[PDB]
Design a binder for this molecule. Structure first.
Ligand SMILES: Nc1nc2c(ncn2[C@@H]2O[C@H](COP(=O)(O)OP(=O)(O)O)[C@@H](O)[C@H]2O)c(=O)[nH]1
Lengths: 205, 85, 393, 80
RNA sequence: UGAAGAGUUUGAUCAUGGCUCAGAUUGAACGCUGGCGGCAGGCCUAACACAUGCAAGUCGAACGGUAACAGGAAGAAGCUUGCUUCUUUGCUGACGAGUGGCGGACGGGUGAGUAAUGUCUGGGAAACUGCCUGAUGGAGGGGGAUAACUACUGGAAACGGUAGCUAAUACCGCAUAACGUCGCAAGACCAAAGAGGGGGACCUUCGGGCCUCUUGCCAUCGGAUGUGCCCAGAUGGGAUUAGCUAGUAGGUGGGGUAACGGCUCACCUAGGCGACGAUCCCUAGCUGGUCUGAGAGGAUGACCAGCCACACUGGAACUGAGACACGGUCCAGACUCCUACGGGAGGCAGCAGUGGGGAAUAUUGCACAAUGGGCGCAAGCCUGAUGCAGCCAUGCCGCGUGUAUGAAGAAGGCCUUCGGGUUGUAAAGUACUUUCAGCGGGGAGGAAGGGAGUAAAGUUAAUACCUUUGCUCAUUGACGUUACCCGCAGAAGAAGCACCGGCUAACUCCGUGCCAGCAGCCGCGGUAAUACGGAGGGUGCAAGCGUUAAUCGGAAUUACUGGGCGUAAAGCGCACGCAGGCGGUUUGUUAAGUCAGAUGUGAAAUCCCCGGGCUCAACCUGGGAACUGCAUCUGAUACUGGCAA
RNA sequence: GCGGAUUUAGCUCAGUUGGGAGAGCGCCAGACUGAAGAUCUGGAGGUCCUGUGUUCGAUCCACAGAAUUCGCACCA
């Protein structure tokens, strides 16, 4: 499913925000965040092992918007390559169009970044798409269209873009609403909350 | 029953009783040689060998001896007389 | 394979009713071969080899005959309608299909049970014209008998809620006629003129949404599953989607033909008895009493407040005051299902001759719409006549 | 019997044809003798979607086996 | 680039060992729920029985012809008069039927039979092979026919019988006779078919002969391809299946097949086979492969490809290069149907449909566009092969059902020392967007070809023809207003399903009270149930979700990899010994086992390695490697085996 | 559509058949423990399948319906 529900309520028991309605707000601003989303359908305790072990598996899973199947499949291409299995996986996960656009400042929210690509206002190269996954690669060209240098939603997401460092492996152009995905990601510096060893144990039978 | 040329069946009625007679004329002549073999004769076995020699030959040219039988069946009946000789 | 027919002249549904004895079965056959000489005729015919298995088997005077014919006046579809006690339930619906009924009553006898019954069943929700036939007038030899009997045929009509004020009365003997007794055959030609004089023609709307009762459901010897009926209103163009809204089942089905007795139509319009053809769905999966309809029609319901008129015992009807906890049977269209009386407060006891609004709980939902006319029978006779005042879930 | 022929291996509403020498007693998708070519009718730019050999379309056509109209017209346009 | 365990016996504990769960899967079914779209799959059972429709023809360029249609001509009419109308005529288009040739032996379907000289792998030798194709040579001259047709004549039909006539690339002679065949040799013996276009010089009784081309025909020897035949090896299970075999085993000579063969026979011999499992019994189509799995292995054989086998039942033969011909024949049999009651007719395991069975599996749809297949020297015709459409969440994949912002945080619930907490930025409220559906409007592409003209630089006649070449022109689209593209309003039209006692992530409040009920296992409930029921809430998955069945995995718990036997499950009560398995030590030899190398082959598909093409992905696809293997060819001699000492 | 035949305490079956509902089991209660048994003491238990009609009176008779079963009937 694409969700469509109460973003920030998740934050509470996520114990992290991970970009839920970022633009003016984050934790404990006009919202009740860092609680438990139950009265006593769920409330804080010591935590189980297996809790953690499931939660973190979903941590990595949710900040791309990938379904059940997909992320496993990426694992079946990684453990088919003779290179690093850990690296490869997070490499394939960032090939999704929706993730790339957010990191070119297009969308102030992860959900919003993916809700751009939906309405016809995106394109890649001279090709028009409306597909939230694509093959994104070195020296591609991320392109805004005509009647998307016209929408007042897009502009209103450049605000936050001035407030996020933006990656160094892509050119980013907001002045003509382009930017190229000129070279491969670095994850020498995004594995900072990601322990690959954990998840790949679990996936294994 | 419906066939495009179910007439094919009737056509073969003709060509199965034509063949028939040619072959059984050829089989009466083989019986005539064998007559003379039990007489010890080279003068009535050979009134029935060279007389079926154009027969046997011209019927291989109607294809009615067939295939590698028809490169064999002018030697098969040659064989006969040679024992007796 | 199969043939062609087309919609030529207006197609008027008629039938033969009565009680047992009478003309009935003999008149049905009689009429058609007489008329067929005079208003039909075609050479190297179907008819003359294939005498005449299909009719004995597929009907018995159950509800229907699949005769189509044009008369030079109109088109007549005759449906042969019960007048045996054993089928009384069926006959309400058949006359409900009817547009005129040939009421054969033998002039030798008086009103018999089914002769009174029918005229009373007619007026309410069935046939609006009665065409009286005194039969057995080669066994009545005296005009003074005839006269007398006629005068009591008047009296039935005139207060069983039809004009008794004149009806064309056709007077002959059935079994005599057919064989070659010319004096009655002549009269048979006058029946296509009394189907104009007295009726003359219905006005049906074909531009409504679809609606059709079940008549008969088949699973044919080599084609698929067929459902028959008289299109009530609306139309069925060949190749279609339909929805069959009904009892406890709602079926979706696709329509892939609409013959008229293996003589193919490209429509099925109102007033026509037709066959229909479907892909999908086998015959036992179709229950009787569902209506074939568009995908657009209302859904079924159980409960509804109603407006019913309690009839009196003189014209048939209740004669004991009655309470909550009765089980009367509701005919809506094709078939019936039991519904119970419950009376919104300020009412518990309901007498002969009342009017009343009461809230129903039928023992199954049946495809329901406001205004839907009905009869209410218990003990096999009408308690009241009513309409669905306000559907509820 | 064996003949030069084309032979779909495309999916639905994809016309990817492969020129095979294949049997008429099995089929064009059945028993092959051999491939011999690839062909695009749509003239795709993919890696080697057109092959048609010189050596077997000059040896099995020696002892006879006929080609197809697109092929006939292709001999000239690869200038073979 | 390659495999993890947990729970469950006991008062406690450690082993042993069963049990269960977490995985992955399906031609799956079921229950609930259901927005779109792309790609794939879809009667597994009663191989039960079937209405109907279709799936098998085409060549006039071999024929004799003219039944219909349309013109040409011809006389004629109307003189409905130079225009309507009527008869005649095969002349021409064109073609009914009938003779003649080739297809109908294919393609398609099914897995019932079938443990298999059937399949698979690998070899082999005594064969065939129309369609195909190379070379050389030929096609000479006669005869007898018979369909149609015609005149009669029998039947309800099916379906006939007389009598007469005639054609051919039909039939049968006769001639000619090798690089032919047979024959040691000497010798002997055998073939046919022409039809088409065109034409200058000549000839004709004016039909044609003459000439030139073209396709087709005949023969002989090859090649290709495809196909018979043999062998070895591998192919399932049961000794509560141990004895088997008379063309049986073999040998002669006969006969037969295309060819090798007891294939078959006469005679002769009396053998042959077997526990390295015969004989018999159970069950099964087989394979590439498929699924799962770290692997080995096990399981399995759906779609797709190959092989084999079957077509109402049984049996049988005909023509042919090819058939025991699914929609050919005949005979017998049971069915089934019709009838003029005399007699006939039929076989969906072909497609689509029908009924019955079953848990379950779709429309009597459109079409020659395209691909392929058939007939034909061509044009052209034919196609339930095929391409499309349709129906079904049967599955794989993609996208959507909105984004932002918004609080004392709205009522409204729910829980609550009654302070509040929770639902909750969720809503209301504010702006912002219209994908996709819906509406209106364009629209690429899948088409190459063939057809009408023109160039030949061939061939001959120099010209034709025919073929060839480019050009020139009008066009070839079934799907379907296709991909796609533009506009049009308006959050609009688009979430569900299971679970929350432990394994296992995810609880409260009530009602019930060992009842009701729950439950994969371990197990729940006896009136203060995190396990039952409802509500509130929480959790995981999401146009699906959950349940079942089923196969492999975990399970190294059948173990070659990878298991035990004092007491846990297991050592015959004990010797002897036949087969079998096993062999101290040294030398010589051999090279079978074995080691090395080489060479074929190891189908396509499939995996992988590298790499592309569709808007992505699904899907499509190229090249390399793999193809673990097997046989063959040659070497090596340490070990294993043989031989010798 | 059309014809038969049949439903009596929670369970197992009587009964009238124009006249007024039992037995057996099994409950449920008061008693012992928390509950239950063993056992102890007390009580309760039918729209007579359903709905009508008749009569002072229907579970009985008569008629409509429902559900079970058992026979029939249907190729536009
Ligand atoms: N004499 C006489 N007999 C008749 C006549 N009409 C009918 N019948 C016979 O009476 C029978 C019954 O009459 P019919 O109306 O057909 O009755 P149903 O089928 O019993 O309703 C027929 O079937 C005939 O045998 C009549 O007009 N005259």
């Amino acid at each position: 499913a694409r969700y469509l529900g109460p973003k920030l309520k998740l934050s509470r028991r996520e114990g992290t925000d991970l970009f839920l309605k970022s633009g003016v707000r984050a934790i404990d601003t006009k919202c009740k965040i860092e609680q438990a989303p139950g009265q006593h359908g769920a409330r804080k305790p010591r935590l189980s092992d297996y809790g953690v072990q499931l939660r973190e598996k979903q941590k990595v899973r949710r900040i791309y918007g990938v379904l059940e199947r997909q992320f496993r499949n990426y694992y079946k291409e990684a453990a088919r390559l003779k290179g690093n299995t850990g690296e490869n996986l997070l490499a394939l996960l960032e090939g999704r169009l929706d993730n790339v656009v957010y990191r070119m400042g297009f969308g102030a929210t992860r959900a919003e970044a993916r809700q751009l690509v939906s309405h016809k206002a995106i394109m890649v190269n001279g090709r028009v798409v409306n597909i939230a996954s694509y093959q994104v690669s070195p020296n591609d060209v991320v392109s805004i269209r005509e009647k998307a240098k016209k929408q007042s939603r897009v502009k209103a997401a450049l605000e936050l873009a001035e407030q996020r460092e933006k990656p160094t492996w892509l050119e980013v152009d907001a002045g003509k609403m382009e930017g190229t995905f000129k070279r491969k990601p670095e994850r020498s510096d995004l594995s900072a909350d990601i322990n690959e060893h954990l998840i790949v144990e679990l996936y294994s039978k | 029953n419906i066939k495009s040329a179910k007439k094919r069946a009737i056509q073969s009625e003709k060509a199965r009783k034509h063949n028939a007679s040619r072959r059984s004329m050829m089989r009466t002549f083989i019986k005539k040689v064998y007559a003379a073999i039990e007489a010890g004769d080279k003068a009535a076995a050979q009134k029935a060998f060279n007389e079926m020699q154009p027969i046997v030959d011209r019927q291989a040219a109607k294809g009615l001896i067939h295939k590698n039988k028809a490169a064999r069946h002018k030697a098969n009946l040659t064989a006969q007389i040679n024992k007796l000789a | 394979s199969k043939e062609k027919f087309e919609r030529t002249k207006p197609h008027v549904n008629v039938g033969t009713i009565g009680h047992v004895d009478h003309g009935k079965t003999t008149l049905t056959a009689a009429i058609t071969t007489v008329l067929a000489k005079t208003y039909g005729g075609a050479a190297r015919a179907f008819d003359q080899i294939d005498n005449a298995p299909e009719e004995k088997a597929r009907g018995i005077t159950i509800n229907t005959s699949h005769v189509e014919y044009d008369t030079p006046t109109r088109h007549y579809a005759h449906v042969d309608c019960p007048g045996h006690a054993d089928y009384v339930k069926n006959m309400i619906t058949g006359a409900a299909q009817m547009d005129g009924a040939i009421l054969v009553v033998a002039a030798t006898d008086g009103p018999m049970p089914q002769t009174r019954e029918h005229i009373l069943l007619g007026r309410q929700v069935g046939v609006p014209y009665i065409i009286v036939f005194l039969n057995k007038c080669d066994m009545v030899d005296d005009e003074e008998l005839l006269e007398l009997v006629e005068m009591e045929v008047r009296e039935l009509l005139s207060q069983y809620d039809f004009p008794g004020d004149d009806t064309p009365i056709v007077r002959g003997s059935a079994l005599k006629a057919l064989e070659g007794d010319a004096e009655w055959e002549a009269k048979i030609l006058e029946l296509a003129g009394f189907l104009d004089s007295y009726i003359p023609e219905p006005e049906r709307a074909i531009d409504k949404p679809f609606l059709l009762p079940i008549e008969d459901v088949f699973s044919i010897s080599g084609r698929g599953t067929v459902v028959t009926g008289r299109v009530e209103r609306g139309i069925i163009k060949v190749g279609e989607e339909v929805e069959i809204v009904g009892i406890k089942e709602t079926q979706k089905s696709t329509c892939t033909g609409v013959e008229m007795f293996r003589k193919l139509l490209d429509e099925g319009r109102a007033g026509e008895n037709v066959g229909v053809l479907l892909r999908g769905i086998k015959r036992e999966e179709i229950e009787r009493g569902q209506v074939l309809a568009k995908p657009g029609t209302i859904k079924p319901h159980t409960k509804f407040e109603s407006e019913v008129y309690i009839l009196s015992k003189d014209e048939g009807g209740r004669h004991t005051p009655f309470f909550k906890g009765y089980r009367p049977q509701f005919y809506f269209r094709t078939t019936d299902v039991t519904g119970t009386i419950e009376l919104p407060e300020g009412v518990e006891m309901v007498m002969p001759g009342d009017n009343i609004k009461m809230v129903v709980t039928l023992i199954h939902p049946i495809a329901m719409d406001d205004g839907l006319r009905f009869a209410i029978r218990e003990g096999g006779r009408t308690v009241g006549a009513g309409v669905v005042a306000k559907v509820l879930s | 019997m064996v003949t030069i022929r084309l032979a779909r291996h495309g999916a639905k509403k994809r016309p990817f044809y492969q020129v095979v020498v294949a049997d008429s007693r099995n089929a064009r998708n059945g028993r092959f003798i051999e491939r011999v070519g690839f062909f695009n009718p749509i003239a795709s730019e993919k890696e080697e979607g057109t092959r048609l050999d010189l050596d077997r379309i000059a040896h099995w056509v020696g002892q006879g086996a006929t080609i197809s109209d697109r092929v006939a017209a292709l001999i000239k346009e690869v200038n073979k």
